[PDB]
Each structure stands twice: as structure tokens, then as C-alpha cells.
Amino acid sequence: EPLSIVYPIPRNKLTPYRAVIIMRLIILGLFFHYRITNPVDSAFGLWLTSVICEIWFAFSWVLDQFPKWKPVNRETFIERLSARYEREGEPSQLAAVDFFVSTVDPLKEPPLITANTVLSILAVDYPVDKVSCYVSDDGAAMLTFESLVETAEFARKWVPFCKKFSIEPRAPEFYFSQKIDYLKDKVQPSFVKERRAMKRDYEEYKVRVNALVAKAQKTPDEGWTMQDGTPWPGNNTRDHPGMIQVFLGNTGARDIEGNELPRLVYVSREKRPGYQHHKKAGAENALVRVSAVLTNAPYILNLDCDHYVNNSKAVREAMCILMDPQVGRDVCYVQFPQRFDGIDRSDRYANRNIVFFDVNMKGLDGIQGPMYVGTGCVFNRQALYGYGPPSMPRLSQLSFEKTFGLSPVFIESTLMENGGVPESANSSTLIKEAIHVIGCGFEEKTEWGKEIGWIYGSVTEDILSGFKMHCRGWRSIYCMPVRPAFKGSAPINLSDRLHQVLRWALGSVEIFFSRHCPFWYGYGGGRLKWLQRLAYINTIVYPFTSLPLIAYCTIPAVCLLTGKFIIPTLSNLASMLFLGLFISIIVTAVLELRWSGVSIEDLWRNEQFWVIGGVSAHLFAVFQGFLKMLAGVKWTTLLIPPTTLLIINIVGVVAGFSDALNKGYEAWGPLFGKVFFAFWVILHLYPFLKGLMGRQNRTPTIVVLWSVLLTSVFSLVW
Amino acid sequence: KERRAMKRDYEEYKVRVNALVAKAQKTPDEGWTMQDGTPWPGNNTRDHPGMIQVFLGNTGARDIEGNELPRLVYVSREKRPGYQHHKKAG
Amino acid sequence: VVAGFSDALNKGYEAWGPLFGKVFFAFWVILHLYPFLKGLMGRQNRTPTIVVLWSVLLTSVFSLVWV
Ligand SMILES: OC[C@H]1O[C@@H](O[C@H]2[C@H](O)[C@@H](O)[C@H](O[C@H]3[C@H](O)[C@@H](O)[C@H](O[C@H]4[C@H](O)[C@@H](O)[C@H](O[C@H]5[C@H](O)[C@@H](O)[C@H](O)O[C@@H]5CO)O[C@@H]4CO)O[C@@H]3CO)O[C@@H]2CO)[C@H](O)[C@@H](O)[C@@H]1O
Ligand SMILES: O=c1ccn([C@@H]2O[C@H](COP(=O)(O)OP(=O)(O)O[C@H]3O[C@H](CO)[C@@H](O)[C@H](O)[C@H]3O)[C@@H](O)[C@H]2O)c(=O)[nH]1
Numbered sequence: 001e002p003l004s005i006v007y008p009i010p011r012n013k014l015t016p017y018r019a020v021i022i023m024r025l026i027i028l029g030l031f032f033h034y035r036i037t038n039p040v041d042s043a044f045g046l047w048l049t050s051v052i053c054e055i056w057f058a059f060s061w062v063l064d065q066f067p068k069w070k071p072v073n074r075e076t077f078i079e080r081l082s083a084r085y086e087r088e089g090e091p092s093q094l095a096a097v098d099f100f101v102s103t104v105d106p107l108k109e110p111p112l113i114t115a116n117t118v119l120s121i122l123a124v125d126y127p128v129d130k131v132s133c134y135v136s137d138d139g140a141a142m143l144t145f146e147s148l149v150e151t152a153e154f155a156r157k158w159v160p161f162c163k164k165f166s167i168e169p170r171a172p173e174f175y176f177s178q179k180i181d182y183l184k185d186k187v188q189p190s191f192v193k194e195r196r197a198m199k200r201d202y203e204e205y206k207v208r209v210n211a212l213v214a215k216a217q218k219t220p221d222e223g224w225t226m227q228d229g230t231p232w233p234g235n236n237t238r239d240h241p242g243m244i245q246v247f248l249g250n251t252g253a254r255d256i257e258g259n260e261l262p263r264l265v266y267v268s269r270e271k272r273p274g275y276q277h278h279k280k281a282g283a284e285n286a287l288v289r290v291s292a293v294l295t296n297a298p299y300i301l302n303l304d305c306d307h308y309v310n311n312s313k314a315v316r317e318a319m320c321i322l323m324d325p326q327v328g329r330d331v332c333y334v335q336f337p338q339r340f341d342g343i344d345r346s347d348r349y350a351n352r353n354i355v356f357f358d359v360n361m362k363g364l365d366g367i368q369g370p371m372y373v374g375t376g377c378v379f380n381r382q383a384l385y386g387y388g389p390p391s392m393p394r395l396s397q398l399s400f401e402k403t404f405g406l407s408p409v410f411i412e413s414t415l416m417e418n419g420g421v422p423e424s425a426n427s428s429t430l431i432k433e434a435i436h437v438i439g440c441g442f443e444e445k446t447e448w449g450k451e452i453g454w455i456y457g458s459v460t461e462d463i464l465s466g467f468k469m470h471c472r473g474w475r476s477i478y479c480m481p482v483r484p485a486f487k488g489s490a491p492i493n494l495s496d497r498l499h500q501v502l503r504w505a506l507g508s509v510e511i512f513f514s515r516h517c518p519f520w521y522g523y524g525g526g527r528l529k530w531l532q533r534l535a536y537i538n539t540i541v542y543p544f545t546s547l548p549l550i551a552y553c554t555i556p557a558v559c560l561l562t563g564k565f566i567i568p569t570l571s572n573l574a575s576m577l578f579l580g581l582f583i584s585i586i587v588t589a590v591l592e593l594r595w596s597g598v599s600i601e602d603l604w605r606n607e608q609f610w611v612i613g614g615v616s617a618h619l620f621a622v623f624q625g626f627l628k629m630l631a632g633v634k635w636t637t638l639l640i641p642p643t644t645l646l647i648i649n650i651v652g653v654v655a656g657f658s659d660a661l662n663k664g665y666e667a668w669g670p671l672f673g674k675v676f677f678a679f680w681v682i683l684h685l686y687p688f689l690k691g692l693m694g695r696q697n698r699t700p701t702i703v704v705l706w707s708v709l710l711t712s713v714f715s716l717v718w
Numbered sequence: 719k720e721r722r723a724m725k726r727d728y729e730e731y732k733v734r735v736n737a738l739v740a741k742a743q744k745t746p747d748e749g750w751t752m753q754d755g756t757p758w759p760g761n762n763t764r765d766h767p768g769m770i771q772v773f774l775g776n777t778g779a780r781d782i783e784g785n786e787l788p789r790l791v792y793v794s795r796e797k798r799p800g801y802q803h804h805k806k807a808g
Numbered sequence: 809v810v811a812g813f814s815d816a817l818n819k820g821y822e823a824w825g826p827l828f829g830k831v832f833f834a835f836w837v838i839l840h841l842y843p844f845l846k847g848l849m850g851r852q853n854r855t856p857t858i859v860v861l862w863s864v865l866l867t868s869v870f871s872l873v874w875v
């Protein structure tokens with residue numbers, strides 16, 4: 001019996017989708033041929049720009065549509081996994097999972113959300129002897145350490161309450177603050193009595209965390225001192241010896257009933273002046289090394305502080321694909337879509353970004369698998385080390401020493417076929433080794449960052465890290481449980497959203513000019529599907545499509561102002577080509593909507609969000625990347641380019657009416673073509689540039705100004 | 719003071735009703751059996767002898783204070799194969 | 809109705825008003841059964857795409873038949 005079944009599109013919604021895109025190519029090819037024939041539109045310069053710019057979009061669509069070829073849907077069952085592995089005979093044979101939570105500063109991001117995430121991690125519906133949790137704080141702060149201690153104390157009450165009543169979500173902050181009737185399917189007789197006590201307990205706990213957070217607002221002049229009566233080892237944010245501690249472990253705090261709980265490990269890296277420490281890749285690599293020595297597990301799950309587990313069966317759902325003997329043989333990681341809560345019904349800023357996850361990720365899952373996003377991925381431990389998929393021909397102590405590190409325990413740790421303490425040494429030695437294997441200069445002669453684990457370099461290291469793992473023949477899987485199984489927080493204000501988009505664009509640009517560029521990287525040895533390298537090419541060259549986009553957004557104003565002629569008037573042959581072009585985009589979207597399940601509105605918003613993203617963030621990102629590449633922004637500054645097009649288009653397009661109207665006003669329709677084409681650009685970036693800022697909500701009664709002054713300058717001309 | 723206790727009791731009752739509903743999702747192979755230790759008279763949806771019972775009547779359960787409550791009568795019609803039974807009018 | 813306009817525009821477009829009458833009759837019909845019949849499909853309004861879907865259908869038909 002198969003643990004998971006992978007079925008493609010049911011063939012009723014697939015062939016039409018393939019047949020429309022394949023037809024669109026021929027229509028585009030014929031459309032391009034017709035334009036190239038015409039050599040003149042009263043301005044050779046505009047003709048050169050428009051044809052070149054339009055050609056770029058066609059390649060972008062080609063690089064963007066083929067990856068969506070052959071979408072694949074997957075279904076997973078947990079009962080068979082439990083029946084096959086849990087076994088009434090016992091013991092369970094389920095694989096271990098390690099959770100990584102990364103933090104940087106307690107003040108910038110509240111620790112309550114981090115504490116709620118940690119509580120969610122420990123409540124997974126998985127054997128307690130298997131799952132483990134790791135929390136990493138780049139900036140050693142007493143608030144984070146104390147918050148975990150408080151979180152561990154409250155975990156004694158929270159865990160048994162969650163397990164006995166099987167409540168979901170298991171994060172108290174995101175569970176109690178829910179208006180869904182909590183008495184929906186509960187059958188236990190004493191659910192209400194325990195729930196009322198738990199809600200009282202959580203509120204008391206929430207107060208303690210707030211007191212702890214507010215306490216640390218002022219820093220004592222001498223420095224932080226632990227309760228035992230010793231200084232906190234890290235008193236300087238830029239200098240603190242590596243710290244490792246174990247909380248709520250097997251040998252320690254137990255549950256109120258008397259059971260054990262998943263072990264929580266608090267590890268902080270060692271920072272010293274004069275050394276460069278990477279932001280997230282370094283922390284993840286340190287966690288991987290620590291996890292291997294402390295509790296070597298065959299799978300690693302990475303999560304962010306904001307994100308929390310929403311489905312208690314996520315570990316089982318993730319493990320049913322990875323632990324399947326047949327399909328799980330070659331799987332580097334299992335990607336889970338990131339779903340954001342606390343978002344209005346009308347997602348103005350397209351924060352949920354369902355189009356990418358519900359279209360691209362599902363479509364891209366058909367070739368090899370999705371791309372690493374940064375969270376909700378169950379990485380195979382061997383895959384991170386960079387060995388290569390099993391059942392393949394090809395991917396000494398010195399080689400292991402030069403490939404992994406100097407610590408013999410960690411070197412010997414990876415030799416373990418499954419995972420665990422090799423010779424069950426005393427905890428002190430393992431702790432001492434774990435403290436030693438997080439040295440500041442530990443990764444000096446090693447390949448960490450270069451070819452093993454998380455990859456250093458670009459800001460968006462997640463894309464880079466996934467690319468190298470897939471380059472060695474590994475596969476990834478896409479999971480879409482009925483429940484999200486992973487939820488976090490999305491940006492609320494635009495300043496963070498635009499910075500988020502800019503940061504993604506800058507990282508991709510850095511990848512393009514780095515050695516890890518899909519154009520000339522990974523060709524040697526193959527093992528990468530030719531149809532997936534196109535997706536990587538698309539994912540790395542997408543920012544460059546913005547420069548023609550701004551040019552395409554600039555042609556309507558330049559033409560409509562003086563030239564007023566981009567293409568020759570239709571010769572009774574372009575009408576069908578233009579008609580075929582416009583209809584082609586509509587039909588493909590419907591079929592893509594038909595099988596993907598996304599809503600048309602989100603597609604319009606995503607299409608309406610791509611245009612604004614390209615003009616503003618990518619243009620600066622490409623120029624900044626080009627400037628940085630040559631060398632080796634504010635919310636106000638980021639909005640400068642898009643405003644320029646908004647002003648130029650609106651003044652240009654409207655001025656076209658005035659100058660054209662003062663003219664014979666009989667040779668119009670080209671005005672409509674340029675006006676409508678100008679409307680195309682403005683309508684794409686009008687709702688955001690206006691909506692994203694606006695004053696309060698549309699209805700300003702200020703739109704009359706354009707009518708008057710343009711009717712007044714018209715009156716000045718009329 | 720009474721309202722808080724009443725809300726707690728109603729929540730407990732709702733939990734009990736939800737448990738009772740969820741328990742009945744899977745029917746036993748032999749058939750439903752009453753608490754006293756006898757089979758439920760109607761084991762077939764299309765065949766069940768007519769049943770009548772009285773709960774919370776004048777002679778029965780009384781209020782906490784000591785007063786009486788309106789009588790409740792649960793009646794299930796008799797259905798047998800080979801006859802046409804109307805949905806609501808009958 | 810949208811076809812009517814098209815043909816009505818290709819015609820002499822001078823003896824109209826009967827065109828207005830038929831348009832108003834079709835509009836009385838359409839306004840009555842458009843809200844419930846279409847609003848059931850979509851969240852609040854697919855105007856984001858419906859208007860452009862309908863608008864291009866007019867110009868596209870206005871052009872193709874005009875050829
Ligand atoms: O990368 C690291 C980072 O990724 C995050 O996920 C990102 C993802 O990486 C991005 O690729 C994605 O951006 C895609 C947009 O969603 C997508 O809509 C758009 O594709 C455009 C395309 O550029 C455009 O040419 C074409 O549209 C047509 C127009 O409508 C027409 O007007 C014009 O004439 O012709 C074109 C084509 O013929 O197709 C679409 C629609 O505009 O751009 C990207 C496509 O790859 O955003 C994601 C946001 O999450 C991830 O979340 C992070 O965790 C990670 O760090
Ligand atoms: O030196 C650091 C600084 C921050 N973090 C944390 O690791 C993640 C890095 O995120 P960051 O680069 O600071 O920007 P964010 O906007 O918080 O996160 C973006 O980048 C993540 C992947 O790196 C994505 O999961 C998010 O959706 C995306 O919003 C966050 O949890 C941070 O708190 C570190 O691990 N090391």
C-alpha cells in the first residue's frame with residue numbers, strides 16, 4: 001500500500017490548459033513577425049524600443065509559463081502512516097524531527113510571538129521521544145532566555161491540555177484569540193472546566209512575559225546579572241561567548257500528569273570583533289551542527305519566529321512522504337505553503353501571494369519540486385550536508401575534516417546511519433562538544449556556506465540554498481494539507497512590504513552576478529531537469545524584466561505626447577492578430593484559474609502588484625544591484641519612480657486630449673489606441689499608487705481638479 | 719451570579735450533546751442498545767414499531783426549586799414496508 | 809444588445825431611437841436578472857475583470873465585424 005498518492009491534473013483541465021498556452025506561442029510568433037515587417041511609425045527610435053521591449057516580455061512569459069507545464073497534485077493519509085509505523089505492538093518507528101526558531105533582537109520583534117511559536121512547536125501530534133526544538137538568538141538577550149524559561153514553565157500546563165483535548169491551533173495567543181465556537185466537536189466531559197482554567201493560566205502567563213519584557217527596557221549600568229548571581233555571559237550584542245542550555249528535556253521538567261515533553265535547546269552563537277557573521281545562514285548552519293551533535297535526526301524542520309504550527313498533524317503529514325520507502329528515497333525537503341492570518345478579506349497589497357503558491361509552486365512541483373522559501377521545510381539531514389540522492393553512482397578523516405570541521409564527534413556523528421549519540425557519553429562531554437562546535441572561527445577551512453548547508457552570499461539565501469541541493473539530483477515535494485499547517489504574520493504597512501519586495505529583488509540580482517548563477521552554474525554533472533533550470537532562470541532573471549517594463553510604461557507618454565504613432569495603422573491583418581493576442585491572455589487566465597483554484601481578483605491584484613513591484617522596487621534593485629555589481633532606500637524614495645510614471649502618464653494622456661482636441665479632432669482613434677494603452681499602464685499602477693497611500697479611502701472629491709485645470713487649460717485653448 | 723453558572727452549565731450541556739452526536743456517527747453492526755440493556759425498538763429507518771414516551775411531565779422530573787415543568791411527549795410513528803408514508807402531513 | 813449597437817453603429821445610425829427602445833427593453837430584462845444570477849458567482853464583484861472582459865468584447869466585436 002502506498003502512503004501517499006500523487007495524481008496529476010485529472011486530464012479534463014490539463015489538455016485545454018496546455019493547448020491554450022501552446023496556441024498562444026504561435027499567436028505571439030505571428031504577432032511578432034507582423035510588427036518586425038513594419039519599419040516605420042514616423043519615428044524609428046520608438047519603433048526600435050517598442051519591438052525590443054515587447055520581445056523581452058515574450059521571453060519572460062516563455063520562462064514563466066513552461067514551468068507551470070504538467071501541474072501535479074498530491075494527497076496524503078495519516079491513518080496508514082500510523083497503522084504501518086506506530087503499531088499497537090510498540091515501540092514507534094517514526095523518524096525524529098528537529099525544529100529551528102531564529103531570533104535576532106527582542107525589542108524589534110516581541111518575544112510573546114516567539115514564545116507562542118515555541119509553544120506551538122512542542123505541541124505537535126508526534127511522539128515526544130522524537131521531536132526536538134531549537135531556539136537561536138543571534139543577539140544574546142536576557143529577555144529571550146528568560147522568556148523561554150517562562151515559556152517552558154507554562155508549557156507544563158499548555159502541552160497536556162492541548163494533547164488531551166486535541167485543540168487546534170496549539171498556539172495559545174492565536175488559539176484563545178479566535179471567535180470560532182470552541183465547543184464545535186469536543187466530546188470530553190471536562191473540556192470547559194479545563195479550558196477556563198487554562199485561559200486564566202495563559203492570561204497570567206501573558207502578564208509575566210509582559211512584565212519580563214517591560215523590565216528589560218532599561219539596562220543596568222553594570223550589566224545584566226543572572227538570578228543565580230553571575231553576570232549574563234553576553235553583555236555586548238557584538239561580543240558574547242557561545243551559550244548552550246537545555247530546557248524541558250527528558251531529564252528535567254516533566255508534565256503535570258507525569259509525562260515527558262519535547263526537549264528545548266537554547267543555543268547562541270559566538271561573536272567576536274573582527275569577524276563577519278551572516279544573518280540567517282550562519283545561525284541555521286550553527287543550529288545544524290549543534291543538532292547533529294546533541295540529537296542527530298534524519299530530518300530538519302526550519303521555521304521563523306512569526307510563523308507557528310496550525311495543524312497538529314503537520315509532522316505526520318510531512319513524514320508520510322519523507323518516510324515512504326518508494327517515493328521518499330530521493331527527497332531533500334518537503335515545502336509547505338506559507339499562509340498569513342490577520343489579513344483583511346480584500347488583501348490590498350497581495351500579501352497572501354496565493355498566485356505563486358497556488359499556481360507556480362503547484363506547477364513547478366511537477367518537474368522536480370518547489371523552491372525553498374525560507375520556512376516550513378522538512379530538510380533531510382543528509383541533503384543539508386551535501387551528499388547526493390541515494391541509489392546513484394556518484395554525488396578519509398582529512399576529507400571529512402576538511403569537508404565538515406575539526407570536531408571528531410561531529411565528524412563521527414554524520415557517519416550514523418539513522419541518528420543518535422554513538423557511544424552514549426556523559427551529557428557534560430556532549431554539551432562541551434556542542435559548545436566547542438559553535439566556535440566563532442569553527443568554519444574557517446570548512447565548506448560550510450560554500451557547498452554544505454545553508455549558502456552564504458545573497459540576501460535571499462533560501463533560493464540559493466535550495467538551488468544547490470536540487471543541482472545534485474535531489475527532489476522536493478509540495479504539501480497542501482486541508483489546514484494551512486503553517487501560519488505567520490504578514491506586513492501590515494507598505495514600508496515593510498516594499499522593503500520586503502526590494503530585499504527579495506536585491507538578493508536575486510546578487511545571485512545572477514554570483515558564481516551560483518543558473519546560466520553557467522550546475523551544467524557540469526547534470527542531474528537538474530532541463531525544464532526546471534528554466535524555472536531557476538526565471539526566478540533569477542525576473543528582476544531584469546522591470547527595466548523594459550518601465551520602458552513599456554514610458555512609451556505611451558512619449559508617443560502620445562509628440563510622436564502619437566507607435567505602430568502603423570492596421571492593414572486588415574493586424575486586427576485578427578491583435579484580437580488573437582487580447583483574447584489569448586483572457587482564455588489562459590481562465591483555464592489557469594479553472595484548475596489552480598485561485599480567484600480572478602487575486603490574479604488581477606498579483607498582475608496589478610507585479611507592475612508596481614517592477615517599476616519601483618526592481619528598477620532600484622537592478623540599478624542598486626548593477627551599481628553594487630559594478631562596485632562589487634526610504635519609503636519615500638522607493639515611491640519616486642512609480643509617481644513619475646503616474647504624473648507623466650496622467651498629464652501626458654490628458655494633454656493628448658487637449659492638443660488633439662485643438663487639432664482637427666477628426667483623426668482620432670489613434671488617440672484611443674494611445675489613450676487606452678496609456679490607460680493600460682495607468683490602470684495597472686493607478687489603484688496602488690492611489691490605494692496604497694490614498695488619503696483615507698477613495699471618495700476624495702479631488703478628482704475634479706484634473707477636469708477643471710485641464711478644462712481650464714482647455715478653456716485657455718478653447 | 720446565576721447567569722454565569724447558567725452559561726457554564728449550558729456549555730457543559732452543549733459539550734455533552736456534541737459528544738452524543740459524534741458517538742452516534744458509527745453504528746454498531748448488531749444495532750443500537752439502550753442504557754437499561756435492551757435494543758432500541760427501531761433499528762431500521764424503514765421499519766420501527768410506534769413508540770411513545772413522556773419526559774419531564776407532571777409525574778416525573780421536577781424543577782430544582784420544586785415546581786413542575788411542561789410535559790414533553792416523544793412519539794415516533796410506525797413504519798412498515800409496502801406502505802406509503804407522507805413526509806410531513808402524515 | 810451589444811451586437812445590436814455594433815450593427816446599429818454600422819447602419820446609417822440616423823434612424824435610431826427604436827434602437828434606444830430595444831436597448832432599454834433588453835436593459836430592463838438584464839438589470840432584473842444580472843444581480844442575483846451573476847453575484848452568486850464571485851465574492852463581491854469580479855468587476856476587476858468583468859468590466860475589462862466586457863469592454864474589450866465590445867471593441868473587439870466592433871472591430872472584427874467592421875472589417
Ligand atoms: O525569490 C525569493 C523569495 O521569493 C518569494 O516568492 C516570490 C517569487 O520569488 C517571485 O517570483 C514572485 O514574483 C512573480 C509574480 O508573482 C508574478 O505575478 C510575476 O510574473 C508576471 C510576469 O513578470 C509578466 O511578464 C507576465 O504578465 C504579463 C502581463 O500581464 C502583460 O501585461 C504583459 O504584456 O505581458 C506579461 C507576460 O506576457 O506574467 C506575470 C503576470 O504579470 O512576477 C514573478 C513571476 O515569476 O513573487 C513571489 C512573492 O512571494 C518568497 O515568498 C520568499 O520567501 C523568497 O524569499
Ligand atoms: O541576523 C539575523 C536577523 C534576523 N533573523 C531572523 O531570520 C529571519 C530572517 O528574516 P529577515 O531577513 O530579517 O526579514 P523578514 O521580513 O522578517 O523575513 C523575510 O525573509 C524570510 C526568509 O528569510 C521569509 O520567510 C519571510 O516571509 C520574509 O518576510 C527572521 O525570522 C528574522 O527574525 C536571523 O535569523 N538572523
Ligand SMILES: [Mg+2]
Nearest residue numbers: 306489490491
Ligand atoms: Mg517579516
